[PDB]
Design a protein around this ligand. Structure first.
Ligand SMILES: *[C@H]1O[C@H](CO)[C@@H](O[C@@H]2O[C@H](CO)[C@@H](O[C@H]3O[C@H](CO[C@H]4O[C@H](CO)[C@@H](O)[C@H](O)[C@@H]4O)[C@@H](O)[C@H](O[C@H]4O[C@H](CO)[C@@H](O)[C@H](O)[C@@H]4O)[C@@H]3O)[C@H](O)[C@H]2NC(C)=O)[C@H](O)[C@H]1NC(C)=O
Ligand SMILES: *[C@H]1O[C@H](CO)[C@@H](O[C@H]2O[C@H](CO)[C@@H](O[C@H]3O[C@H](CO[C@H]4O[C@H](CO)[C@@H](O)[C@H](O)[C@@H]4O)[C@@H](O)[C@H](O[C@H]4O[C@H](CO)[C@@H](O)[C@H](O)[C@@H]4O)[C@@H]3O)[C@H](O)[C@H]2NC(C)=O)[C@H](O)[C@H]1NC(C)=O
Ligand SMILES: *[C@@H]1O[C@H](CO)[C@@H](O[C@@H]2O[C@H](CO)[C@@H](O[C@@H]3O[C@H](CO)[C@@H](O)[C@H](O)[C@@H]3O)[C@H](O)[C@H]2NC(C)=O)[C@H](O)[C@H]1NC(C)=O
Ligand SMILES: *[C@@H]1O[C@H](CO)[C@@H](O[C@@H]2O[C@H](CO)[C@@H](O[C@H]3O[C@H](CO)[C@@H](O)[C@H](O)[C@@H]3O)[C@H](O)[C@H]2NC(C)=O)[C@H](O)[C@H]1NC(C)=O
Ligand SMILES: *[C@H]1O[C@H](CO)[C@@H](O[C@H]2O[C@H](CO)[C@@H](O[C@@H]3O[C@H](CO)[C@@H](O)[C@H](O)[C@@H]3O)[C@H](O)[C@H]2NC(C)=O)[C@H](O)[C@H]1NC(C)=O
Ligand SMILES: *[C@H]1O[C@H](CO)[C@@H](O[C@H]2O[C@H](CO)[C@@H](O[C@@H]3O[C@H](CO)[C@@H](O)[C@H](O)[C@@H]3O)[C@H](O)[C@H]2NC(C)=O)[C@H](O)[C@H]1NC(C)=O
Ligand SMILES: *[C@@H]1O[C@H](CO[C@@H]2O[C@@H](C)[C@@H](O)[C@@H](O)[C@@H]2O)[C@@H](O[C@@H]2O[C@H](CO)[C@@H](O)[C@H](O)[C@H]2NC(C)=O)[C@H](O)[C@H]1NC(C)=O
Ligand SMILES: *[C@@H]1O[C@H](CO[C@H]2O[C@@H](C)[C@@H](O)[C@@H](O)[C@@H]2O)[C@@H](O[C@@H]2O[C@H](CO)[C@@H](O)[C@H](O)[C@H]2NC(C)=O)[C@H](O)[C@H]1NC(C)=O
Ligand SMILES: *[C@@H]1O[C@H](CO)[C@@H](O[C@H]2O[C@H](CO)[C@@H](O)[C@H](O)[C@H]2NC(C)=O)[C@H](O)[C@H]1NC(C)=O
Ligand SMILES: *[C@@H]1O[C@H](CO)[C@@H](O[C@H]2O[C@H](CO)[C@@H](O)[C@H](O)[C@H]2NC(C)=O)[C@H](O)[C@H]1NC(C)=O
Ligand SMILES: *[C@@H]1O[C@H](CO)[C@@H](O[C@H]2O[C@H](CO)[C@@H](O)[C@H](O)[C@H]2NC(C)=O)[C@H](O)[C@H]1NC(C)=O
Ligand SMILES: *[C@@H]1O[C@H](CO)[C@@H](O[C@H]2O[C@H](CO)[C@@H](O)[C@H](O)[C@H]2NC(C)=O)[C@H](O)[C@H]1NC(C)=O
Ligand SMILES: *[C@H]1O[C@H](CO)[C@@H](O[C@@H]2O[C@H](CO)[C@@H](O)[C@H](O)[C@H]2NC(C)=O)[C@H](O)[C@H]1NC(C)=O
Ligand SMILES: *[C@H]1O[C@H](CO)[C@@H](O[C@@H]2O[C@H](CO)[C@@H](O)[C@H](O)[C@H]2NC(C)=O)[C@H](O)[C@H]1NC(C)=O
Ligand code: NAG
Ligand code: NAG
Ligand code: NAG
Ligand code: NAG
Lengths: 661, 668
RNA sequence: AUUCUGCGGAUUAUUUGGCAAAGGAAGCAUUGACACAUGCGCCAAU
RNA sequence: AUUGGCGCAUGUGUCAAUGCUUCCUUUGCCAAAUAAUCCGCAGAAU
């Protein structure tokens, strides 16, 4: 086994009998994932210390009351996915300290007597998928403190004020009841539960009426959370959840319900509902009176909540949710915004509209007008096919901090105005578009920027002076990867005293490092930590173009053509933590070059290079390898030598430098 | 100094100040052209009394004394083009009676008095163009006995008279140029006065349909055969236009670049002898059946860019209708490239029963699909050549060529063909030589694609994105007489050895750019190239090749040229080349070759002509370049750039070191 | 038979990653064709 | 000098060809996950 400290962990051993050869000084034992005859109730003397046991996923026929008295110190008994066809009270009579009881696949079709007239400390109690046709587990009031009764994937037909009353002052925190083909909730079938907090009627085929009816039985109860996922509420009315009026409801779920109708004031009865999920549903539209009722709601989810003859929500439909702060509407077909869509949400601080529109080709200055009085900080607009953003398009989103226009068709030339009004904007994720010609003023209007992504946006004109990023001083993270940036003059990046992370992966910045003076890129970004120049056409790192970058933590120059390392390219990276020069054309590893960075390094990576197995080359290196503990992955396979003949395909590591010096 | 060398003393652009005359007197020619020349010292030519001709043009020569001709009695060619010589009289050439070629092109000699050449009796070529001549007259007496070329073009002649032309009595001109001359009138009998006038060139002379129509009669009863009318304003023609030629014997006629919009009926009814006719670069609206009535002798017709642009919006797409070529029963070469003709008609080419060469490259605009009724017209025409490149052809249905029985060379390249050849598209090409089919959209092949035409010698399939060439048998299975095969730039995914089975004549094979990389342990390497004993030049440049497996070049004795450039090949298992002992040129440039051993490159290096392995990561140690560096020192197999592009890549002290300068005196 | 358990093997679909290659495009460099200039020296006719 | 013909050399632009670098897309193969279906060995439950 893994014999993990204290807790015995036997993963998958294809084990035969119940073993007792390892330590006897422990409190847990994993036997799960093994072939088990039955549980020897007496073979548990050598282990009189175990507190819990991972004993599920085994072929266990039956169990004797013996196993509980042999291990008085036992809180968790895991017996899920086992046989145990039938059982009575005897089995757990000696388990009074038990707190978590697990039985998931034991097809225990019926239950007689009061089987747990003992467990007083048992909270979790999963009895699901076991063929139970009833909920009853006794006629007396037991299970003093139980907080989870899992009965789902079972075949219960109904609930009565009688087969449920066995819980008297019993207060369940989470009562599961999924997959049960319930057709009726006998009156007062909840008034009999001590105090019922959570509930889960997932996949139980509920009719708008069974639902409408069930509600009243959920009245005057301490119920706060309720799940109705995967049912047939093809529609709802004010009368549907009418029964809940007498309740105190926090979260309500109605996802995956092919809900086509969401009648008026259907929720007029939840003046306390704070959370509501309408995910994956087919709603036709939302008139203004749609949400009348939820005046406490703070999180609304319409992820894929509409039909696909296009569906749409009209103005002043959210006017009632004056306390909502998180509105999600991803994966949908809504045409476009209206002049008054989001009118009313004066608390909205997080809004997502990823792949939510179909005809919003152009972002106009009248698009987000609705969100004028909403304290909006987040706005995801990815995947909307947005191809052009006119002036003042965001002027109303005064307090916006994180805006995201990625994975879109934007093809225009930022002239600083598109950001007119983003007073305090944090980051602007703008990666993955068609074309983004920049100008000298593109960002002058928003100098509050910290992160600016521009991945695969085919940038053009970044060589103009001053640097279009000139006004972005508080800028820390900047990404210009996968743009095939033709070229760029040093002016760029001038004054970014905070630029920490910079990405240039894939940008043919090749020739910029002789002819016309080597572009002393990266001047003074003292604070620059992780630099990325992977696959950039780099063939020659010129003398000291990494000077004064003391705080530079991670350099990545993979996928390049770099064999000519002028001694001293790395000098100030004496704080470097991880270097990457994989898939290059590196022949030799000298000390004047890789020395200083190798100093306090954490993990190096130079696999797949044409290593030369001679002493003018790998000598200093092979040794460092033998005598350093800087994590170097695959040193064993992918560090082979390429020359000369006798040393071809020879693991670089196994090179005796005992004949060299 | 000059170049001299063998009696033709050539002094190139030498910046020559004064006419130099050194010892190479034992010669017969001297080039002084392209140098700064004061004047020609008529006496400095004693040290050179042997010269037969002199390249003396493109120099600043003021004037010339009659002296230079008597100093060099042995003189046939006098080149004085692009020089000054403003004026001159008979004196200048009095001593040049042996002279046969006289050149004067840029000397602005505006007028000519007397009989300047009362001496030249052996002078044939006589170029006097761009010289400011306002007249053709060069004398009043009948001289220049035997002259075959009188070049007077780019001049300012206003007309030709039976008077200023008569100075040629029994004089028979073979080629009489008269281009750029602003001629407005041809005084009657202005040719009846030339002994015998064969050729003529009135290029860019601004001729009216009438000046033309008129000029014709003066060209009558003359010995005229060729006539050029390029760059004029014959915006149209009628039967009456060339009516004056009826009294002639006309071989070739040119009317290119004439914005000809009208080609009236029977405009050529008068040329029962014209064999050649060029209507290139013109704007003809259409060709009714009666268009070509008259040319029953024509054998070569050119309509290259000969019909008006397509309007599309103005619906003015020009076109020729049926039975318009019925008269040219003797034509054998018809060209109609660069045009807007809509498409073929059921009877377009009807009548051409001699047509053996036909070109229709970029001739059609709406011929998206080749139907079985397209080339019906060419049914009775002995067609051997057919270029259809650049027509946007995207689909060729069954029996599309059935009528072209005798076709040998067919070309459907640079087209949009996107269909799957199922052997039927070639139904009827009884004796077809080559099928150039490169540069199309997609050509899915089947097991029968070529079974119908086993007469194939060459089959090109460059950049046609072939698909399914791995099917068995090889779709080329029935092509036995096939010699040249090209499957380049198709990114052929893969292929099994079956392919090429039985091509005992396959000599040239091209595989440039086809990621055939991994084919050389997936179920064993593919014994591609089995038994093509007769394969001469093999090309596998840039093919992903990273490992040439053991002996996949066995029995290829007759293989002359292997090209494996742009690949990743450093692992050469001794003996990959054994039977290429006849190899003449190897190419393994831009690879990842470390070392050159003898067990590997030995046999081919034997009788080799030219090797090429530049740009590789050469290792400057003896386990590697040792045997090689020597071969270099002691072999004379032409190896280009051995000096620069054969540097070493390892180790450190030998990096960037010319491979050649490696002393193997410390090894072996 | 219906199913639970452990281990191993197979096929398909979707997603990703790597390698090789193709097409098109971008930046830089080289070469050749041509056109519009310039400076130097020499000349020619006014 | 006005206009022109030469000789040498230096410019810009357009077009075309070639080479290096790169990017986007696609194709072949391979690897890893996830899911669906299946098959073999071993023990078992009603
Ligand atoms: C507005 O909404 C958008 C969606 O509605 C938000 O975008 C979503 O962001 C999440 C989180 O970034 C994305 O999820 C993962 O995206 C990448 C891509 O996955 C790739 O790696 C997988 C690994 O197995 C592959 O299987 C995939 O095929 C694919 O190639 C992942 O790489 C991320 O995982 C990361 O996991 C750890 C966590 O830090 C890292 O260590 C890893 O290195 C790795 O990077 C993401 O979890 C999600 O794709 C995207 N939406 C979707 C589903 O498309 C958008 O961000 C939001 N705006 C904001 C900022 O609020
Ligand atoms: C039916 O008619 C077609 C035209 O209507 C004709 O099409 C072409 O035929 C061939 C190609 O198929 C072509 O050949 C000449 O042109 C190529 C291309 O050269 C290019 O590159 C040059 C680079 O410096 C550039 O200057 C040029 O401007 C041009 O863009 C040229 O390479 C050929 O010469 C080479 O030939 C050898 C190559 O095998 C080589 O070894 C030699 O050294 C030499 O360089 C040719 O000069 C024609 O020009 C195309 N026609 C036109 C006008 O487009 C079809 O071939 C014809 N079908 C048949 C076969 O009947
Ligand atoms: C074009 O036609 C011919 C070219 O073949 C040229 O004229 C021909 O000139 C010859 C002799 O000069 C003529 O010969 C005569 O032929 C007759 C007919 O058989 C014969 O009986 C006589 O004995 C004599 O030999 C010939 O007829 C004549 N051809 C024509 C036009 O009929 C001339 O170059 C051109 N035509 C003309 C005259 O413009
Ligand atoms: C959901 O409904 C209510 C949310 O608005 C809230 O009801 C609370 O009910 C208790 C009843 O025990 C009230 O407490 C009263 O307790 C005794 C009654 O015997 C009085 O002497 C006290 O003075 C006190 O008023 C609460 O006032 C009432 N909550 C409030 C402040 O509105 C519960 O959250 C839920 N009701 C239940 C338990 O079903
Ligand atoms: C939102 O306002 C932008 C800034 O005013 C505006 O920029 C565009 O228009 C201005 C003129 O209004 C251009 O600036 C210059 O204006 C003078 C005359 O006022 C012109 O002589 C000069 O040629 C130039 O046009 C900006 O250059 C121009 N931006 C670009 C690069 O197109 C926006 O147009 C406007 N909203 C949009 C996107 O239309
Ligand atoms: C000319 O090109 C093709 C060559 O014959 C020709 O083939 C296609 O049609 C034939 C029948 O004419 C198909 O042959 C078979 O026909 C029997 C009919 O009973 C089917 O049962 C059998 O499955 C098969 O289809 C060919 O399969 C089919 N394509 C090939 C050659 O695989 C074309 O029809 C003809 N050109 C056209 C499209 O008119
Ligand atoms: C919600 O109920 C209304 C019925 O009341 C009307 O609409 C309210 C939003 C409010 O504005 C009241 O003053 C109105 O009296 C449904 O509204 C329309 O009802 C008519 C009935 O003739 C129907 O034809 C329309 O389709 C409805 N929509 C329009 C054009 O206003 C509304 O349909 C109900 N919500 C849904 C769609 O279930
Ligand atoms: C050449 O002459 C034709 C008429 O002469 C021939 O036209 C053939 C199409 C055919 O009928 C043949 O038997 C006949 O000998 C002229 O074309 C006609 O021109 C008149 C104007 O006078 C118009 O009515 C038509 O465009 C056209 N009609 C016909 C019957 O073709 C024309 O002068 C010239 N051809 C062309 C179009 O250039
Ligand atoms: C309703 O939702 C779940 C139980 O179904 C609970 O969620 C809240 O408590 C969790 C701690 O266990 C937090 O991690 C969750 O983030 C939090 N929900 C939120 C605000 O996201 C919650 O206890 C249940 N009912 C309530 C509100 O008590
Ligand atoms: C964005 O600004 C306003 C939106 O408030 C748009 O409308 C105004 O623009 C012009 C002002 O003279 C006129 O064309 C409109 O009549 C005027 N209307 C309003 C709302 O007052 C404006 O068009 C938008 N910007 C543009 C032009 O794209
Ligand atoms: C007319 O044709 C050209 C004029 O440019 C010349 O060449 C002709 O004769 C050559 C010798 O047989 C051939 O090679 C040419 O193909 C042929 N040109 C033609 C007509 O196509 C020649 O000057 C002329 N020939 C004569 C005298 O008729
Ligand atoms: C190609 O073959 C002939 C060539 O003219 C076309 O015509 C024949 O086939 C057609 C049958 O649908 C009809 O046009 C006639 O039956 C016949 N014509 C004859 C010989 O008079 C034929 O249409 C073309 N191929 C097809 C059938 O599409
Ligand atoms: C970015 O730079 C700093 C740090 O974010 C911001 O300065 C803050 O605000 C004022 C400066 O005028 C002072 O209170 C402190 O210097 C900073 N306070 C802190 C620590 O948050 C500066 O205002 C920012 N620039 C922008 C986006 O306007
Ligand atoms: C291709 O191979 C040869 C090429 O010469 C062809 O045979 C010649 O052509 C005919 C055959 O019909 C004979 O009359 C000749 O005598 C043969 N050449 C000589 C003189 O030996 C053969 O027919 C062709 N094969 C195919 C399928 O086209
Ligand atoms: C729960 O248990 C008893 C019944 O056994 C019940 O009467 C009483 O209300 C509760 N006692 C507690 C735990 O306070
Ligand atoms: C001819 O030769 C003489 C010999 O002295 C020389 O001076 C003269 O320059 C030559 N002719 C010229 C001017 O070229
Ligand atoms: C050419 O010479 C004279 C010119 O006067 C002429 O009479 C004679 O007949 C011609 N020679 C021939 C062709 O016999
Ligand atoms: C219990 O398991 C052990 C396995 O080590 C075995 O030796 C012993 O015989 C078993 N006892 C029973 C129940 O027979």
């Amino acid at each position: 086994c893994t014999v993990r400290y204290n807790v015995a962990d036997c993963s998958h051993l294809k084990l035969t009998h119940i073993p007792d050869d390892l330590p006897s000084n422990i409190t847990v034992l994993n036997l799960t994932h093994n072939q088990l005859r039955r549980l020897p109730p007496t073979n548990f003397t050598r282990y009189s210390q175990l507190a819990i046991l991972d004993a599920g996923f085994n072929s266990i026929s039956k169990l004797e009351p013996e196993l509980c008295q042999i291990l008085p110190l036992l809180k968790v008994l895991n017996l899920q996915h086992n046989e145990l066809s039938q059982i009575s009270d005897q089995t757990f009579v000696f388990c009074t300290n038990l707190t978590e009881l697990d039985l998931m696949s034991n097809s225990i079709h019926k239950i007689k007597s009061n089987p747990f007239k003992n467990q007083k400390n048992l909270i979790k109690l999963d009895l699901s998928h076991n063929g139970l046709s009833s909920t009853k587990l006794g006629t007396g009031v037991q299970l003093e403190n139980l907080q989870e009764l899992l009965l789902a994937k079972n075949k219960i037909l109904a609930l009565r004020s009688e087969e449920l009353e066995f819980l008297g002052n019993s207060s369940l925190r989470k009562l599961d009841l999924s997959s049960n083909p319930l057709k009726e909730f006998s009156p007062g079938c909840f008034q009999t539960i001590g105090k019922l907090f959570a509930l889960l009627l997932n996949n139980a085929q509920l009719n708008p009426h069974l639902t409408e009816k069930l509600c009243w039985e959920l009245s005057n109860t301490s119920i706060q959370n309720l799940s109705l996922a995967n049912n047939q509420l093809l529609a709802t009315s004010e009368s549907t959840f009418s029964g809940l009026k007498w309740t105190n409801l926090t979260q309500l779920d109605l996802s995956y319900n092919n809900l086509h109708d969401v009648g008026n004031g259907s929720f007029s009865y939840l003046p306390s509902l704070r959370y509501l999920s309408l995910e994956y549903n087919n709603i036709q539209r939302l008139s203004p009176r749609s949400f009348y009722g939820l005046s406490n709601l703070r999180y609304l989810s319409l992820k894929r909540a509409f039909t696909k003859s296009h569906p749409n929500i009209d103005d002043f439909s959210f006017q009632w949710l004056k306390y909502l702060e998180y509105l999600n509407m991803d994966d949908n077909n809504i045409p476009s915004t209206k002049s008054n869509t989001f009118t009313g949400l004066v608390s909205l601080k997080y809004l997502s509209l990823s792949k939510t529109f179909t005809s919003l080709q152009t972002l106009t200055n009248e698009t987000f007008v609705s969100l004028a009085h909403s304290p909006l900080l987040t706005l995801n607009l990815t995947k909307n096919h947005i191809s052009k953003i006119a002036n003042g398009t965001f002027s109303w989103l005064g307090q916006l901090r994180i805006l995201d226009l990625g994975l879109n068709e934007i093809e225009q030339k930022l002239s600083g105005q598109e950001w007119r009004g983003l007073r305090n904007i944090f980051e602007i994720y703008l990666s993955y578009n068609k074309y983004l010609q920049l100008s000298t003023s593109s960002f002058a209007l928003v100098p509050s920027l910290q992160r600016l992504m521009l991945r695969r946006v085919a940038l053009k004109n970044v060589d103009i002076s001053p640097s279009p990023f000139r006004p972005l001083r508080n800028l820390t993270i900047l990404d210009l990867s996968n743009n095939n940036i033709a070229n760029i003059n040093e002016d760029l990046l001038e004054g970014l005293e905070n630029l920490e992370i910079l990405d240039f992966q894939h940008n043919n910045l090749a020739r910029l490092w002789n002819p016309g003076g080597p572009v002393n890129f990266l001047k003074g970004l003292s604070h620059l930590h992780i630099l990325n120049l992977e696959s950039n056409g780099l063939d020659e790192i010129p003398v000291g173009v990494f000077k004064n970058l003391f705080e530079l933590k991670s350099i990545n120059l993979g996928l390049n053509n770099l064999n000519k390392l002028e001694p001293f390219i790395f000098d100030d990276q004496t704080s470097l933590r991880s270097l990457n020069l994989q898939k290059n054309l590196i022949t030799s590893v000298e000390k004047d070059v890789f020395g200083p960075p190798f100093q306090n390094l954490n993990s190096l990576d130079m696999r797949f290079n044409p290593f030369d197995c001679t002493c003018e080359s790998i000598s200093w290196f092979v040794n460092w390898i033998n005598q350093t503990h800087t994590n170097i992955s695959e040193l064993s396979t992918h560090y082979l030598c390429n020359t000369p003949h006798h040393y071809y395909g020879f693991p670089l590591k196994l090179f005796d430098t005992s004949s060299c010096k």
